[PDB]
Each structure stands twice: as C-alpha cells, then as structure tokens.
Amino acid sequence: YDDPPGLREKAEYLLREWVNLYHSAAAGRDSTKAFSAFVGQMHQQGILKTDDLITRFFRLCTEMCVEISYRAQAEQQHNPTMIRAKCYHNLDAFVRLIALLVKHSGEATNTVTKINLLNKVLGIVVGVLLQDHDVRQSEFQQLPYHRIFIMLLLELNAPEHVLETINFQTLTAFCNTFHILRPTKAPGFVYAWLELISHRIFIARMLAHTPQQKGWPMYAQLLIDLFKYLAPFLRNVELTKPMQILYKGTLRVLLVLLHDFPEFLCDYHYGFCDVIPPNCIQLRNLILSAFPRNMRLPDPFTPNLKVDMLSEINIAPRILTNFTGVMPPQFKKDLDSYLKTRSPVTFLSDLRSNLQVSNEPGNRYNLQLINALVLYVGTQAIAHIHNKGSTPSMSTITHSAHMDIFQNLAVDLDTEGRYLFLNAIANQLRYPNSHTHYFSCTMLYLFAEANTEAIQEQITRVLLERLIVNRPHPWGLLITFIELIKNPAFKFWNHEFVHCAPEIEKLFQSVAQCCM
C-alpha cells in the first residue's frame, strides 16, 4: 500500500487501548483523564505530527472497525443482538473517540479546526464506505457505517456549549455527507441512507432548531435525492412488491413530516410533486394535504360556504422553487409576449409543438415544463386580475391570453397530454390561497366551457383518483369536487359518462367512503 511501515501496529494498539478505556471508565474525571492520557499517547506515537498520518490513522481505524464487524458476523454464523453488541462495542468506542477529538480540537473558541476535523473524518469514512461497496459488492454491509454516522450525529448533538456553538455546521457536514452518499451514487447503502435522512432527531434539528430556516433547503435536497432515486421504480407497477420496503420508509418519513412539520411540506410541495411520478397518489397526497397550522380550514360540507369571502383566499402561497427556469428562454419570451399582447394565435398550436418530446406512449411530454407552464400562466393571470382591480372568479378568469392557453391545452393535447395538464392544475388545489382558488375556478370553467364530454369525464376521473386515498385530503381538491357535483350550473348529473357507467359510480362510492 501507500502507508508508512509500522503504522498499522500503532493504529491497532491505539484503537484497542481506546476501546478498553471506553468500556472501563465512567463519566466524570475518569473519562477526561482517559482522553487526555490517550491524546498525549497519540502525540507520543507520532500520529498527530502530519495531516497525512492523521488521515491514515482515521482510515485504518475505520477499516479495522469494519473488519471487526465482518468477522463478528462470520463468527455468529459459525456458532449458533449480541454480535450486534460486539460490532457496536468497537464502533461506539471509535465514534466516542471521534466526537471527543472533534470537541477538544484546538481552542475552545476556535470552531474552524473542529468543523474541519469533522468534515475530514466524515470524508475518510465516506471513502472507506465507497471502496468497501465497490470491492465487497454483494457481501457489502451497511450496518457499521450506519452505526458510525448516526452515533456520531447523536454524540455531536449533545447539550454542550462547544457542541452547540458548532451545531449548525455539524448538521451541514452531515447533510453534505448524506448528499454525497445519495442512492444514485451509492445504491448498496440506500436503506441505511434512508434510515439516516429520516431519523427523527436529525429531522428535528434540521427543520426546527435552526432559525432563518437555513436547514430547510438542504433537507429538501436530501428528500429530492430520495425521490429522484425512487422515481423510475415507483413509476413501474411491476416493481410494487420488491419496492415495498423503500416505499414504506418514504411513506413513513412523509407521514412524520406531515404530522410534525406541515409548513415544510407546504413550502416545497412543487419540487416534490415535480420529481415524484403522478401515479404515486398516496405520497403526493401527503405532500399536497399539508397546510400551515396557524390556518383554520373551513368545513367543505358547510351549508353555503362563501369561498370568495374567505380572508386567506386573496393571499398567495410561497413557492421556494424556480419553476420558471425549466422554460427555454425563447419560449419564455414568446409566452410573455402572448400574455401581454394576446397575439399571435399560432402560438397555441406552437404550444403543443413545444410541450411534446416523443411519440412513445407514456413518454410523449415534458412533465416539468407542463407543470411550470400551468403554474406560471396561473400566477401571471392572478397578478393580472389583481392589477385590474378585482379578484379571480368564474367571470374574471375568462377570455384572456392565459385562459386561451388553458383551453387550447384542453382541446389540442391528446389524452396523455390532457392528463398531465389537468394533473398540473390539480397540484395547486390545496389550502385556501389565491392559487387554490384560481385553479379551482379554472378546472371548473374548463369543465363548463367544454364542447365534448371527453375532457369532462377526464377531469372527473382525475378528481376521483386523487380523492380515493386515506385522510386527510387537500382542501381545494375536495372543494372543487363538491362544487362540481353540487352546483346545478355545471349540470354534472345530466352528462352521459356518469349516466350509464356503474364503474364511475363505484369510484363515487369509494370517494364517499374515503372523504365523506
């Protein structure tokens, strides 16, 4: 190798001595004298002399811990949670060593060298992990690295002054490490990775502990990594059973975030919906049903509910995603041009020309571009109406460039395109806000102004499929559906697709059981 001779023996001796100390000494003066003596001895053995020697020290320690894990598993299999307790014996010892070396690195006020040491060690561990993954392949075990990472995270999130002065930077280091170990880059570690990013304490420290919400974008990045990895598997229905574990983990963390951090799921709903395939009704529903806890949703079954007279209706939701960038510059320019001047009309056929990418069934369109187009046209419409001195309604969103785009997409797109379009609209049907209201009115208008029953039945089936899911449900979705069914102006029950079919009746019964 490239290691200096005799270093392995030094590292072995030191690691074993430290394990012994760790499992012999109690908290108090004993732990401090033990760590001080051990550090002194580290200086004596000339391991802290150069950065390289430190690197090789941590690397050798990691490798030895891992090999102890493997050997322990083997010895277990040969001789019929205790083995777990051995692996974790050595691993927890080493972790304690790392945390202590980070905590007491340099001065008490000098946080720089502490964080640098933390990122150094984490990097080394990452290297060992990736190497082990590339070599062992199928025999690779996630457990030791998982243990190291989570126990180090827990140790460094202790209620101590020095540790609290560097907490956010610690969390930053761990976020970077988790991002580098993303399942698209380290597939053999995806389960442990999911366990690490969906750990309750990590989530707590990321989404609550830090002010200014600087932790929200990072965790959002982690979740987006997860969804990006899961998308092609979740999209194929034949992989439902083998993906049960990861799906249930994702469902779990989404449930956690829903019940305890709904604001976060609100602020980043668009990116998540953008990455998660449209067939995953449940997860997406968890993401869309989220609403700020300082808001009280009125009962959708309230006798004659005045939606337009709600206070939060005129307020716009916060979107922390740059959906505009998905649009090409020239297309965006032509879009703004037509929105400003309502000319020329050819721009609409050109719209279908711009949204479609392939002729292959299922992969004909650019989903992100459709979502972005819908949301952008919607927001521009809301702003336009607001600038005219009025609020969006059934008679204020009509006969304009925006609605021209909407109706044209509603007729000129094929069934697939229409589905993606209607879904792109439905993704904004959430808690009382300007987007929810505008897109509700847009959906209902598209239903009413329709010249054929195709798009009507399609809308109905979209709402239906989005409603058949465990409680809760997005407010605007249920509101839109209820308004469509109850308001005699839309004459819903006089149509043919609902008159004959007992299938859509079954769907209606399911919706009645889930939402009513």
Partner: peptide, 14 residues
C-alpha cells in the same frame, strides 16, 4: 346516481 342529495343518500354499510 342522479343528483347531489341522491349521492348523499347512499347506503355504504349495506
């Protein structure tokens, strides 16, 4: 179903 009230008059448990 034939209307809104007709839909609300459904008997699911039976």
């Amino acid at each position: 179903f034939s209307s809104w009230n007709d839909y609300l008059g459904l008997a699911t448990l039976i």
